[PDB]
Amino acid sequence: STQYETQGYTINNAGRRLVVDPITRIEGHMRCEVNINDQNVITNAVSCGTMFRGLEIILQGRDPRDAWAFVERICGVCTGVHALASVYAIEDAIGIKVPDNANIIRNIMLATLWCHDHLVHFYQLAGMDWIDVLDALKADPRKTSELAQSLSSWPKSSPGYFFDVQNRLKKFVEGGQLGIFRNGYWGHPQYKLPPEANLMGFAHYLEALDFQREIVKIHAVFGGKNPHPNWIVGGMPCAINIDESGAVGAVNMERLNLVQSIITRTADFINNVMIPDALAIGQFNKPWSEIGTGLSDKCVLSYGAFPDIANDFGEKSLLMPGGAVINGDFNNVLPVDLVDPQQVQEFVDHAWYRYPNDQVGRHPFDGITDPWYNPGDVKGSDTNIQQLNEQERYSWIKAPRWRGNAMEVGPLARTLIAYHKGDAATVESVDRMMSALNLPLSGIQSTLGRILCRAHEAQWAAGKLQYFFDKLMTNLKNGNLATASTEKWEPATWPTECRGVGFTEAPRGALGHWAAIRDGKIDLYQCVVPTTWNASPRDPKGQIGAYEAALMNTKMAIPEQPLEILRTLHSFDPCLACSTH
Amino acid sequence: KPRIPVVWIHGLECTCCTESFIRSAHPLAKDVILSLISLDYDDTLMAAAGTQAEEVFEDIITQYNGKYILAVEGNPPLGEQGMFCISSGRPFIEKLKRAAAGASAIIAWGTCASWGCVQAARPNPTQATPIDKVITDKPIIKVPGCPPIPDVMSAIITYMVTFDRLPDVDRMGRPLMFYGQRIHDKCYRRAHFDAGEFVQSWDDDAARKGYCLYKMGCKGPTTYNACSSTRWNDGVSFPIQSGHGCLGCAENGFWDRGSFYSRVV
Ligand code: SF4
Ligand code: FCO
Ligand code: F3S
Ligand SMILES: [Cl-]
Ligand SMILES: [Cl-]
Ligand SMILES: [Cl-]
Ligand SMILES: [Mg+2]
Ligand code: NI
């Protein structure tokens, strides 16, 4: 066994080794290993991406106008975000400016995704780490109604309703066919909700499973379908026609009315179901405000998103702030430049890729994706990994660093950046939320904080949907209908050689696509994705990524039942297809 | 009284097929899961992880050997001895073969499981391979699309449950009900196609009147799916209705059939 110091942690692989493979209730394929000491405390954590497809390789030689459709398939959970980053990157390379309505609609597509993705994550992915579904069977329906009514104005709260939900669960379980609840962690001492809160949460899990399907109707109107809507380089393909012949063949007043109806319903659900549930999880699980801090009190990163001024990606335009904090110095939010070769770099000394020199990091314009499955000595065989060797290569995920620093990205990172840049709405929201929980600000830098920030973001995004929709309608009232710029659609109009960066904030954090075009075709296409940051393996200095740091120092009540590991990992909302692409 | 056991496994994928499934409007995915099937294993949604998830997998395929339906999302890579997709430390293909052996029938969800989809597009770095090239001794129903239509997924499920039989299929294993006709055979813009009324560049006057997208590269004429009739997301739209030509996403190798903006040959 070995031991070394990094980022204030003591990384020690002595003691019992635990393996969690597969990690479930995430997107895609992940393996986690930890070592625990004699006090059942984690002293080593190993994050492993267990899938790879090679989109960066597949994109070579494609027409840049087609790229968005390929890279959209990086992920069907964060569906659309890679298409947005792609059209941004190609437009940046060629020098294309899109019409205002195209930008507004793109912002609507992104805000719609944030609402949908965050809602499903809260209930379907992370929810069962916090809600003991089986314990809901011991709830009093009247007490459940009383609890729900004390927390929210949401209409659906009758004792009869909660009795009906409980009875359905009872009948579901009675024959032994527990389905998704089979062999769960039910009864674990870390489940702290009373039975009435478990029944309320489970009812809401079902309501959210039903309701989420409606949110994406906004993607269907502007983008044809969800998952995987359509886009174009130059704007959007959803031509608008309000008051002319043939409006039946375009985005017309009836289509816009449908969009408005979905926006209102989405805000209602988020504000009156998700938000009170998140706060309730906080109230019953306060110790989790001090678990899973990881890098969130050290290094956080946002690129920023939602340019409100069309084709302007600067600080005055982006509605979601960008910036970086390192070394716990939140008084100095640093500017991020995605072209600067000394800023974003990826390392592969601990990943299954080949570089000419694996001791150096490569900026994505210098990126290389040469897969090399080389696990070394793994206590089994190349096709039977019993124990990853974290001293060498152990993941399909590359290791991104920012100025050589390991960073956390995502809702908590964004919230901290916005808070410390002095965004008034963020400061007010965060302070009020922490006051309601009777917790200090530092309580947000934790596994519980990640969950609270995500719910806050869904509420923010639902509000922004209305703002963007109103902006669109304002343009239409002024007779501004344009949705595409085609001046530079034809390859004959492009520079022979050019390169571009497209960036945004996906639901899970900072996303960048780096594209180089030559002779009308993609010469290089490199992606660094939010879960690539968070689930990163180690670098040449032995610095650990966000997941590994967040798992460090964690007490486990029952080593064989990894509930604490799942709680912290799920709080980051891992997307493994994203991370590896 | 008991519900039919279903094991849903995941290879190399983007998870768009699971996401499409939960969009179902009728029946709601909630009702499919609670009342129509017993969804006994599914990485994306299940409570159990790690060894507990392995225990569920092993228990279900043993207890219900010969009697469960296997749903497959994504596909196995043959490269690097299968270790481009690792599950419980071992190649995904081993779990696929184990799960297939005890299945009564297999549903290959999406273009990934049916054909290969994006990871199989040139130069196919991982040797991603569709299910029917690996499993050769089981009924496989291909339900292609990237992803398939949500209400098509659920209609296929309800058909099998209600009628206690597999859907009749074409020569490629696709259900005739939804894949028997082309997008272009039921497209509401066909009047324009037949009149030579085409969008020529984005947001031109033709686009604003809903003219045909053939000259913009629409692959509807060579693509079999239900998008132009059943439509998407509770009948709200489909690619062509919102102004983009069909990409061909339900067809084998659609990624490599030339630019999406080049006209059908
Ligand atoms: S839009 Fe496409 S599917 Fe419809 S008529 Fe034109 S070519 Fe055919
Ligand atoms: N959100 C999201 Fe997917 C990841 N990680 C992207 O980008
Ligand atoms: S791209 Fe796919 S979703 Fe339908 S309209 Fe074409 S088959
Ligand atoms: Cl350039
Ligand atoms: Cl046939
Ligand atoms: Cl294919
Ligand atoms: Mg990459
Ligand atoms: Ni994703």
Curated annotation (Swiss-Prot), chain A:
SUPFAM superfamilies: HydB/Nqo4-like (SSF56762). Its main location: membrane. Its cofactor is Ni(2+). GO terms for cellular component: [Ni-Fe] hydrogenase complex; membrane; outer membrane-bounded periplasmic space; periplasmic side of plasma membrane. Binds 1 nickel ion per subunit. Ni(2+) binds at residues 75, 78, 575, 578. Heterodimer of a large and a small subunit. This is one of three E.coli hydrogenases synthesized in response to different physiological conditions. HYD1 is believed to have a role in hydrogen cycling during fermentative growth. This is Hydrogenase-1 large chain.
From Swiss-Prot, chain B:
GO terms for cellular component: [Ni-Fe] hydrogenase complex; ferredoxin hydrogenase complex; membrane; periplasmic side of plasma membrane. One of its GO terms (biological process) is anaerobic respiration. Keywords: 3Fe-4S, 4Fe-4S, Cell inner membrane, Cell membrane, Iron, Iron-sulfur, Membrane, Metal-binding, Oxidoreductase, Signal, Transmembrane, Transmembrane helix. It comes from the Bacteria. It is a single-pass type I membrane protein. One of its GO terms (molecular function) is 3 iron, 4 sulfur cluster binding. Heterodimer of a large and a small subunit. This is Hydrogenase-1 small chain. It comes from Escherichia coli (strain K12). The chain holds residues 49 to 313 of 372 of the full protein.
